[PDB]
Structures are given as C-alpha cells and as structure tokens.
Model the fold of this input.
Amino acid sequence: IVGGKVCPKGECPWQVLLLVNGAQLCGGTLINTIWVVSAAHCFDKIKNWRNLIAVLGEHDLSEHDGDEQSRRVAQVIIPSTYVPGTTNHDIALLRLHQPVVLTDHVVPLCLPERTFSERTLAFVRFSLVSGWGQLLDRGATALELMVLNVPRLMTQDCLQQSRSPNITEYMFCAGYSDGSKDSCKGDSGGPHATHYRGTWYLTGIVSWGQGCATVGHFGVYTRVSQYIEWLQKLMRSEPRPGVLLRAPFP
Amino acid sequence: LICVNENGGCEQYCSDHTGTKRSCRCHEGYSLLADGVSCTPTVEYPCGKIPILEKR
Ligand SMILES: Nc1nccc2cc(NC(=O)NCc3ccccc3)ccc12
Ligand SMILES: [Ca+2]
Ligand SMILES: [Cl-]
Ligand SMILES: [Cl-]
Done:
C-alpha cells in the first residue's frame, strides 16, 4: 500500500496473509471460518501446492503476539474462465484445512448478496484496501499491515480519466491518478471493503494496475458482485482430492 | 418500497415481492428487528463488525 497508514491492530480482522514456504505470497479475505477469498493470479507459479499457509490475526510480521492463527490451504478453487498470466476473472476461493477460531482479532468480512452489492454497495464512493505490500513503487514491503481509503470510479470515467488490458465487466477501478495513493503488487488478493450502515462488506479484490501509484492510472479490482453465486455454490460443495480445482464459471 | 431505491429502507438485504411488497433480510449471525428493516447481531463475532471498535 502506497500513501496509506498503519491499520491499527485488530481493525482489519478479516485480512489474510498467504505464505508459500514461509515467504509472503499474497493477501486475502476471510469470509467465514473456513473460507478465504483471494486473487487467481497469486497461484500462477505455485510449485508445491502443499506448502501454502493462510495466517489470520496477523499485524506486525516482525513479532509473534499470540493472536495469529495459521492454517494449511486444503483447496484453491479458480473459475474456469481465468487464464493464467492474464487479468480477467481474477478470483480464487480457498478452503482452510481446519476452521479458524473467531476472536477480537479474527472476524470474517460479509460476502454480500449480488443485488445488494450491485444496487447499493457499488455506489458507496470510498472503500478500504489493505495489505503488507510495497510502501513505494520499487520499494520494500510493509512489516505492519497498512490500509488506504480509495474512491471507486464508473468504468466509463476510469477509461476517460486514464492516461493496457481492457477493464471488463468483471473489474472496477478505484484510487487516484496523481501517483500518491494505491495498492501495489504485494497487496494482491487482499480486500476492498465497503461500509454500509454499520457493517463492512467484500466488494473487490486487489488485482492489477500499471506499476504502483503510477501517474495517470488507477488500481483495478476484481468485481466480486459478479461471483457471489459461484462462491456460494462452491462453499456448499464437498472437498475434492487435490489442492487445485478449476470450477465452471458461471 | 423497492429495493433499488434507498435499499428498500433495509439495513442489509432486500427482496421485492409481487405487489407493493418488500422483505428485508439479514446475513447469518444477525436477526431482523420488528421494524422490518434493522439487523442486530445474534452471535459474538458477526461478519463485517470490528470488535475493538464495537466495544469502543
Ligand atoms: N492497485 C494496483 N496499482 C498498481 C499496480 C498493481 C499491481 C498489482 N499486482 C500485480 O499486477 N500482480 C501481477 C499480475 C500478474 C498477472 C495478472 C494480474 C496481476 C495489484 C494492484 C495494483
Ligand atoms: Ca505478528
Ligand atoms: Cl495436490
Ligand atoms: Cl429482488
């Protein structure tokens, strides 16, 4: 995250850190005790699928304070329409091997109904984006979880204001064109969270952009409203052998 | 009321029905109050709420 601030410990309780052999991979979002939503592109180059770990209740990566909970990732589910190395349909649903325990520091974000998300949430101007990604373009990643308030654009206005891949109906833009404030590579997969009447909801996934905080460009986020029904169906399904699952979309 | 305007007056989710009818609904971990619009937690850690801030 560029141009944000430290999320106070416990104020981003749905944030997930994904690790591969101990190393930072991506962020994600807890949406109930065993399911995490992340970006498909985070998994393009995975070697050993059996060393993927999700950590909840994380804040300062330099220390252990006892609020962290780690789980193995039992399943990574990606839509059939996702093509590795490209930007469209950038969403993954991850099943944890054992539930996390909800606590003051570990709470899921609400996965909204589609209609509510499209008719109401899509019109809330500002939303929060978070992660332990780069603090600057070409710079070091964060040791403490960072957060940034970013405004959403209608895609017509995004394209008019930008100066790439297409912005599809499965995406939306948010942020700033002056190069001051953005999510960044290492924030991939993390939440774009939207407040409405006292409750926060999952509306986007940190997906892609041009460099980070590049003048003339906005952040591009996966439009989670397009995937509610797909996610809900998968969350009712039985696990299948083998970590990676490609599931039909729609 | 209609769900596309002002969220049908609902705090959370909204369904249109046949007639000038509307039903509000709540996410798991919440229940709907007698006003027919408001949602109150039914569990300790409902989704989308931040405990340290709810405590204050
Ligand atoms: N908001 C933002 N502003 C600028 C740059 C960004 C780069 C981001 N991450 C990546 O681009 N990862 C690589 C990738 C590869 C294949 C497909 C998709 C992404 C994520 C978010 C960004
Ligand atoms: Ca820690
Ligand atoms: Cl496997
Ligand atoms: Cl409806």
Observations:
- The first strand of chain B starts at residue 13 and ends at 17.
